[PDB]
Design a protein around this ligand. Structure first.
Ligand code: SF4
Ligand SMILES: [Zn+2]
Ligand SMILES: [Zn+2]
Ligand SMILES: [Zn+2]
Ligand SMILES: [Zn+2]
Lengths: 634, 351, 754
């Protein structure tokens, strides 16, 4: 395989002892408590360099715990690659951390810290005459470059040449490290094996991307305008990928629907070569290009939206294109048009591929297409930390070292979705919910507790409260017929199942532009995928919504940027869940999920004057049972 | 290396009779984040602490507050000796967020008129909270500075972490040519000492001027409860004071009676001035080799004062900061308090 | 203050001293003991001319041989800076010693800057004012008023009285600066130009710019009595070679040939119409050609000369006959043939490179004028024009410039190159061709300066590196000593802003136009500093053409929108009076409460002589590193000669002058030791050019200030604004580098004499 597990070693290396665990020598004189056993850096308030330890630890590790006084750290195996790129010294990281953190630097923690600072994310790759050579930036890389089976064995004895480095660059190593060092030019066969030998020895390399030195690929028709929006999480993903001088390829997990592709297109502009965008599914290609990409300076007519059912121009574009994995290689090959793109992707030397939510598509096709396509570099703009695409070939080492992580706590607190007040509404029970819980336990009951009139009335508090507050109210309900029955009573336009698209955006038109209509009831038609709206109060009614990885994507998706800060809590979330019903387990999974995602959590069970709110239809227990039998039809 | 007062403040003359009007600034420059909450919220509180201490150390003075918003000079409290009204105005200032830029010349024009009703005996002073890097002068600001120096209106400005010549020229010009009031701030504690140094009088060189012999009164207490009344506020005052001359009731305060217009002070105004006029010499740390004192304190009982034959502990220092004339040792913590609130040296008094 | 250099009692004017001066003053005396040139990188933040003059002021009262001095600078602005500071020094000398100064020094600029007649002073251009005063009193025009009364010829009324009363002694006792000389001469009906032009032979110290010691048309009044045994100081001598390049350069245009043909035709009438007026006066000057080069009445005159000589001062010019062109009519013969030959040599296919000797040979076959006769045009034109008592000169201005080229072409060769581009590359493919001629070896004018001079001093605080100067100009130095600013406080932050808010490499090398990937970062830099920085911000763009697109496209977006409200912005403009009005309204704003920002050009006039004190500058921004490759291959042709005659390549020459230009602009922000301020520089290549920065600045640029973020640099200047603005005056750490009055210098420097 061309990927190594070292990009995803996270989730392990969190375990210590008491008699086995050694008491920290720095505990007597040290501000923080960085115990290598638990993988934590408990930075106390007395630290002389508490911010520095977080900066050094943040670059190299992941802080699992976020207490006000003392913090905690989580296992991050990929942090060696990111920690190496940041610049933390191999000895320097341990020496400062051991002295500052009270927990003494353990051999495994120090060796990994010593390895992470230098060996992790500090590989050596040479290049001569604007090409790839069998060498490295340092003396170790020069021995490493010649010691590679493809880097060294597949290398010509000539140190460097203008024609070979420009053309040939055991294939053209454009995923090499910093050039202008001792090396010797290489052959042009097997970058597949070249990235296979790197991962087996587990050597995370600080790769470069020298587009200007590649004569085989001409300069493509790219309309270089950065006029697209730039956002606090977007520039550093550019900056860290670009670094100094040449750019590189890697994994940058981003919020979907928050201009995730914006870094890639701007990164595509800088490299000036063949770039393609891969999306989750074909229907997303047109919907997402129509939802934000018009303001973007990318060219819709040149970026042929590959769908395999509607036909555009292919194998003929002089510039960039936008497609999906399903269009690339899946059972969703509607015709031979998709396979014709795949054949052209081999004859054309494609240097950059933008990925949008790879996790939905299994990675097995990712390796199949790469070998035939003969790609130079890639970019996987995923969203989820845990995924099914952790096969033998890790997409991190398949593409390159990670640069920036989807720090959702940064974007849900900086003004877009700041002050995330997650709630789970426990609507008061009654006889029929208890009658329905005992009689039947099948999943057909999934809508027989959703139909709670107090849930709708609990929503109606959020309807009246947030419209009075000038906020935005979003309701999530995978059902259709019962959801349609909901908002007719309150007599307002509302999103519903199989809504006409022009009407729903017209409902959205009164939603985020006008304040009188502010409640929108998104169905399962929302994902995947449609325009994820600006979120100020999100209501989720369906709580199973398999699987949990979809929930992380859906939680990040609908909860979107809100450019409004009047209230102290400018981003509400509510989980209207009937209690003493089946959704106890499903809701309690969400309750742990939101707090584990980092968002602030609360429980809203007592509305301000619950029984005095308007539209008291079906409030009495008798009327609620009648609707439950109507929902039996669904 | 020792950081204390150099030799001694020679007790001849200090300014107790004064009317210091601080000019705050609520400008979009103060919206820029330098302090912990922001520039605007933090400075107000340290001025709030400044006001009470200014009344604490200079109770025979009056206070005024000036704010600068949107390039306009705005007063929130007239020059007066009322601590609570000044804070109340600052709360509304605290409640609001800054906007615009400061207007130096308008404040200087405001300052000249504002201290015109200030009496001759009260030493004129205007405190400028100037933090931004620009002003708004609708005329010749060099003319008004020429007016304040000619009319004997000294100006001390409290600049933020920025240095401007016009403010430095303003400090130099008004203060009888002296350029020693241009200290700036860089920290939470750093800005407070500028206010705290403004709490104490500011002598550099007092010139020979026509001194005024002024008349002032001492009030008398009241005790009535059911007959609760006062002739100053005309409210239900269950306790107050009385001028010996006008027999017009006033609340329990140093408030000047509104009938015969003579200054009223109870005990603090004369006494708070007395400790300011004649400060004693600072209790410098007496040498450990030249201590010749017992292992304890004298003003209080601090037995800790000698490590004795303990390497880098012995030959260090000692809690033996002794007063000069009194020749009595005292701990550094104690001897600091000896010159912090009340001078009241034990060895000097115990004679 | 009165300290010694073991032989010189120095009457130092500042009560406090600066160790960099003492290091400068100690070694500069050794240069005076054993003659050299002694490039000394004296700090510019320190007062360089304060001890530069004061030591030399004490030089004359002790050393009795060097009765004359030369102070030469790039602009008259630094001449008067010397004048204003030195004027106090002479009065400071009288304050301590009594009456022992006996010093005379006046600035020499021109007729334009020192004219007092309201009729003459109206005009703006100096030459027109120079022409009006010269025609007001000319060796052939002013005689036509005294002998016969007329309204055609007026009188200066100030040269008239100078001709009567001023040239009998020296000015009474004042050491007049530009401001002081203007005031004195206004009330006493005198024009200050004719004083100092005559005062060359009487000034114990002579004050004039670099041109009047180097430029051949104006340096004909140089006196060996003030040149043989004198001491010469070159102030801001970093821009010395560039001036010499212009001295032997000249362009032409297709419009000018129409004027040149006008002058050729109009003078043809002029010389012929006066023939019937006085034909014997015409021929009388012909017998003046056979005898010699007209020496009796071409050089021994008070006012007569009209045509300037671009050749070296009369040494590189034979005195033989100028061919058979003696006749007035026959003068027309070769004039019209040569003007036609140059026109087809003005419409050349493209830039062609021929040795200027070969141009004479190609001329020789088309128009048979031998090289030796053609060298005599300059003294010919004055010999002929004087006879015609010409009254109209407008179309004749082309005659003096073309004939200036005629003297140059027949005399200079194998060091220069002739080029004729058919158009300007920025406005290519048009009938606007140039007779391009530019100087390739500046040392031809430099060497004769060192040929006669014995005491010479070269000093500049921006020269970096200091080693190519002796090899470029071919002069002998002995004391190459460098100075680093030793202070107890930083007071300056040279910055290497490679990465901006986008963290993208910023420069101006990529193009000479605007682009959203680049322009949004520079503007975001300007606004972010405008929020925080204190009053006084000066920037120096690489070129003025670059800035016009920069500001106009800045106006398109709302990036300046917040910059509008922060400070007061005044722009550098092609007209000098407006920019001086812009700059005079910049300094007042900076001193006043409101903040101000100035924008200028690295190659502009601002970087030449302008100073910026505390208020006038606190944070200076440098958009990129200025490369002067924008123009046509003229400089490429110029650069080739430097590559083979000297071992200085394009890469070494380009960056080292660019940083020299960069270091020239930066140091203006600091005035004294007390002065402080950040000097930010924004280009990626500034990482590599840390070597080209001056050692005093380069030392301040540690390896930790490379490729900073500008927002971090905002924090860096935020910390600078927090730290430096503090009135930190410990007064005990001063004495290490402040050397309080007459105490620590005598105490400590005796330990330094080892
Ligand atoms: S006489 Fe003197 S002042 Fe008058 S125009 Fe001539 S040079 Fe100028
Ligand atoms: Zn009352
Ligand atoms: Zn009274
Ligand atoms: Zn005492
Ligand atoms: Zn004590």
């Amino acid at each position: 395989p061309a990927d190594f597990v070292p990009d995803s070693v996270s989730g392990m290396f969190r375990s210590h002892d008491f008699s086995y665990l050694r008491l920290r020598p720095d505990h007597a004189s040290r501000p923080l408590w960085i115990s290598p056993s638990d993988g934590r850096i408990i930075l106390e308030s007395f630290s002389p360099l508490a911010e520095q330890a977080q900066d050094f630890l943040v670059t190299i590790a992941e802080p699992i715990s976020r207490p006000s006084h003392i913090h905690e750290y989580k296992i991050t195996a990929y942090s060696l690659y990111a920690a190496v790129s940041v610049g933390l010294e191999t000895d320097d990281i341990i020496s400062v951390l051991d002295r500052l953190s009270k927990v003494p630097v353990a051999e495994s923690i120090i060796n990994f810290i010593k390895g992470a600072t230098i060996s992790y994310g500090k590989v050596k790759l040479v290049i001569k005459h604007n090409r790839y050579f069998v060498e490295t930036t340092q003396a170790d890389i020069l021995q490493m470059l010649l010691n590679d089976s493809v880097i060294g064995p597949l290398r010509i004895d000539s140190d460097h040449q203008v024609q070979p480095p420009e053309d040939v660059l055991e294939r053209e190593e454009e995923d090499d490290d910093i050039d202008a060092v001792h090396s010797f030019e290489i052959a042009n066969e097997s970058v597949e094996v070249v990235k296979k030998r790197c991962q087996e020895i587990d050597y995370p390399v600080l790769e470069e991307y020298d587009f200007r030195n590649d004569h085989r690929n001409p300069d493509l028709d790219i309309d270089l305008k950065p006029s697209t929006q730039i956002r606090p999480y977007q520039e550093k993903s550019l900056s860290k990928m670009f670094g100094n001088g040449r750019a590189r390829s890697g994994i940058i997990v981003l919020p979907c629907g928050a201009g995730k592709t914006l870094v890639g297109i701007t990164a595509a502009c800088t490299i000036k070569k063949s770039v393609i965008v891969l999306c989750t599914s074909s229907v997303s290609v047109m919907q997402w290009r129509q939802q934000f990409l018009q303001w973007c300076t990318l060219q819709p007519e040149n970026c042929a939206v590959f769908t395999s059912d509607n036909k555009e121009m292919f194998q003929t574009e002089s510039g960039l294109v936008v497609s999906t994995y399903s269009m690339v290689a899946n059972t969703r090959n509607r015709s031979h048009d998709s396979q014709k793109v795949m054949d052209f992707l081999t004859g054309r030397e494609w240097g950059f591929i933008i990925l949008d939510e790879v996790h939905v598509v299994p990675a097995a096709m990712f390796r199949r297409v790469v070998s035939t396509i003969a790609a130079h570099a890639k970019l996987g703009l995923t969203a989820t930390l845990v995924r099914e695409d952790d096969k033998i070939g890790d997409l991190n080492f398949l593409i390159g070292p990670k640069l920036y992580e989807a720090n959702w706590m940064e974007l849900s607190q900086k003004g877009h979705i700041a002050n995330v007040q997650c709630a789970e509404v426990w609507c008061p029970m009654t006889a029929e919910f208890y009658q329905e819980y005992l009689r039947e336990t099948a999943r057909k009951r999934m809508l027989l507790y959703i139909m709670n009139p107090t849930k709708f009335q609990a929503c109606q508090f959020l309807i009246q409260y947030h419209e009075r507050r000038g906020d935005k109210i979003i309701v999530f309900s995978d059902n259709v017929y019962a959801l349609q029955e909901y908002a007719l009573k309150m007599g307002k336009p509302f999103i519903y199942g199989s809504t006409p698209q022009q009407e729903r955006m017209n409902i959205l038109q009164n939603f985020q532009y006008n304040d009188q209509i502010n409640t929108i009831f998104l169905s399962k038609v929302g994902d995947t995928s449609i325009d994820l709206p600006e979120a100020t109060c999100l209501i989720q009614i369906s709580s199973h919504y398999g699987s949990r990885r979809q929930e992380a994507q859906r939680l990040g998706r609908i909860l979107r940027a809100k450019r409004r800060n009047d209230e102290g809590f400018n981003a509400f979330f509510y989980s209207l869940v009937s209690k003493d019903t089946q959704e106890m387990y499903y809701s309690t999974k969400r309750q742990a999920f939101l707090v584990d995602q980092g968002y602030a959590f609360k429980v809203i069970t007592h509305l301000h004057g619950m029984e005095n709110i308007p539209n008291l239809a079906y409030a009495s227990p008798r009327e609620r049972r009648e609707l439950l039998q109507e929902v039996l039809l669904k | 290396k020792k950081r204390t007062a150099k030799k001694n403040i020679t007790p001849y003359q200090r300014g107790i009779i004064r009317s210091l009007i601080l000019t705050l600034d609520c400008s979009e420059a103060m919206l820029e984040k330098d302090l912990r909450p922001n520039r605007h919220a933090m400075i107000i509180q340290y001025a709030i602490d400044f006001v009470h201490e200014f009344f604490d150390q200079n109770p025979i003075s009056q206070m005024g507050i000036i704010i600068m918003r949107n390039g306009l000079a705005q007063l929130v409290s007239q020059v007066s000796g009322n601590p609570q009204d000044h804070i109340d105005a600052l709360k509304s200032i605290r409640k609001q967020e800054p906007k615009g830029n400061p207007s130096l010349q308008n404040a200087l024009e405001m300052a000249r008129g504002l201290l015109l009703p200030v009496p001759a005996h009260c030493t004129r002073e205007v405190l400028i909270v100037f933090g931004s890097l620009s002003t708004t002068d609708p005329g010749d600001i060099h003319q008004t500075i020429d007016s304040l120096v000619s009319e004997k209106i000294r100006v001390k400005v409290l600049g933020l972490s920025a240095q401007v010549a016009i403010c430095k020229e303003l400090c130099k010009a008004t203060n009888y040519g002296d350029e020693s009031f241009y200290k700036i701030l860089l920290d939470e504690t750093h800005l407070k000492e500028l206010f705290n140094e403004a709490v104490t009088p500011l002598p550099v060189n007092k010139i020979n001027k026509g001194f005024t012999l002024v008349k002032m009164g001492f009030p008398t207490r009241i005790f009535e409860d059911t007959p609760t009344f006062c002739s100053c506020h005309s409210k239900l005052v269950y306790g107050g004071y009385f001028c010996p001359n006008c027999h017009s009731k006033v609340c329990s305060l140093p408030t000047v009676c509104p009938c015969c217009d003579l200054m009223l002070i109870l005990s603090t105004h004369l006494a708070r001035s007395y400790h300011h006029l004649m400060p004693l010499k600072t209790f410098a740390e007496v040498p450990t080799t030249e201590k010749f004192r017992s292992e304890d304190c004298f003003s209080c009982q601090s037995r800790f004062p000698x490590x004795x034959x303990x390497x880098x502990x012995x030959x260090x220092x000692x809690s033996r900061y002794r007063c000069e004339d009194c020749k009595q040792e005292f701990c550094v913590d104690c001897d600091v308090f000896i010159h912090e609130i009340l001078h009241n040296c034990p060895g000097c008094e115990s004679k | 203050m009165k300290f010694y250099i073991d032989d010189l009692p120095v009457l130092f004017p500042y009560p406090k001293i600066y160790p960099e001066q003492y290091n400068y003053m100690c070694d500069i005396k050794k240069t005076l003991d054993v003659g050299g040139n002694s490039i000394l990188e004296m700090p510019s933040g320190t007062g360089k001319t304060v001890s530069l003059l004061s030591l030399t002021i004490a030089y004359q009262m002790h050393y009795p041989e060097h009765r004359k001095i030369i102070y030469c600078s790039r602009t008259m602005s630094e001449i008067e800076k010397a004048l204003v500071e030195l004027e106090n020094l002479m009065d400071y000398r009288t304050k301590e010693l009594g009456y022992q100064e006996d010093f005379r020094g006046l600035g020499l600029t021109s007729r334009k800057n020192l004219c007092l007649h309201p009729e003459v002073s109206k005009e703006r251009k100096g030459t027109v004012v120079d022409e009006k005063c010269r025609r007001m009193t000319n060796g052939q025009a002013k005689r036509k008023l005294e002998e016969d009364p007329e309204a055609n010829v007026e009188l200066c009324e100030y040269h008239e009285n100078l001709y009567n009363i001023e040239v009998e002694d020296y000015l009474p006792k004042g050491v007049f600066s530009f401001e002081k000389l203007l005031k004195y001469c206004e009330e006493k009906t005198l024009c200050p130009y004719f004083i100092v032009r005559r005062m060359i032979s009487l000034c114990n110290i002579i004050i004039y710019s670099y041109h009047y010691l180097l430029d051949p048309k104006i340096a004909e009044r140089v006196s060996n009595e003030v040149s043989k045994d004198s001491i010469v100081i070159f102030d801001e001598a970093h821009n010395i070679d560039n001036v010499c390049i212009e001295s032997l350069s000249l362009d032409l245009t297709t419009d000018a040939l129409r004027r040149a043909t006008r002058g050729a035709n109009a003078l043809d009438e002029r010389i012929s119409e006066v023939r019937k007026v006085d034909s014997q006066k015409l021929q009388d000057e012909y017998e003046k050609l056979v005898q010699g080069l007209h020496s009796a009445d071409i050089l021994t005159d008070q006012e007569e000369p009209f045509v300037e000589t671009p050749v070296l001062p009369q040494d590189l010019l034979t005195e033989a006959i100028p061919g058979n062109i003696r006749r007035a009519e026959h003068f027309v013969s070769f004039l019209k043939r040569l003007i036609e030959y140059l026109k087809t040599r003005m419409k050349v296919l493209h830039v062609i490179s021929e040795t200027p000797k070969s141009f004479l040979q190609h001329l020789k076959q088309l128009t048979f004028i031998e090289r030796k006769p053609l060298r005599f045009c300059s003294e010919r034109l004055s010999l002929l024009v004087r006879t015609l008592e010409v009254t109209e000169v407008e179309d004749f201005t082309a005659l003096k410039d073309i004939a200036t080229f005629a003297t140059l072409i027949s005399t200079y060769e194998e060091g220069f190159l002739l080029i004729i581009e058919p158009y300007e590359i920025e406005n290519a493919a048009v009938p606007n061709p140039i007779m391009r001629f530019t100087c390739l070896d500046a040392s031809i004018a430099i060497k004769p300066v060192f040929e006669r001079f014995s005491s010479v001093i070269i000093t500049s605080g921006t020269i970096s590196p200091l080693d190519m100067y002796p090899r470029m100009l071919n002069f002998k130095t002995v004391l190459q000593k460098s100075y680093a600013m030793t202070l107890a406080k930083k007071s300056f932050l040279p910055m290497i802003i490679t990465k901006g808010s986008d963290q993208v490499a910023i420069s101006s090398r990529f193009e000479i136009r605007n682009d959203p990937s680049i322009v949004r970062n520079y503007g975001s830099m300007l606004v972010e500093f405008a929020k925080i920085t204190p009053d006084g911000m000066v920037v120096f763009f690489p070129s003025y053409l670059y800035m016009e697109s920069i500001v106009s496209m800045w106006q398109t977006m709302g990036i300046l929108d917040e910059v509008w409200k922060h400070k007061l912005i005044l722009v550098e403009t092609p007209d000098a009076q407006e920019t001086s009005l812009a700059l005079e309204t910049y300094r007042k704003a900076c001193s006043n409460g409101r903040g101000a920002i100035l924008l200028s050009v690295a190659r502009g006039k601002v970087s030449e002589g302008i100073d910026f004190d505390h208020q006038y500058g606190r944070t200076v921004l440098m958009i990129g590193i200025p490369f002067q490759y924008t123009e046509s291959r003229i400089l490429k042709a110029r650069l080739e000669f430097m590559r083979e005659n000297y071992r200085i390549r394009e890469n070494d020459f380009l960056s080292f002058d660019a940083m020299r230009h960069a270091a020239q602009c930066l140091g203006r922000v600091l005035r004294g030791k007390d002065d402080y301020g950040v000097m930010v520089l924004a280009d990626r290549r500034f990482s590599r050019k840390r070597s080209q920065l001056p050692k005093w600045i380069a030392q301040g640029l540690s390896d930790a200030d490379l490729n900073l973020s500008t927002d971090m640099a905002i924090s860096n200047t935020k910390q600078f604004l927090r730290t430096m603005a503090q009135p930190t005056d410990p007064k005990d750490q001063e004495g290490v580098s402040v050397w309080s009055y007459e105490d620590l210098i005598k105490h400590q420097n005796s330990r330094k004499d080892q």
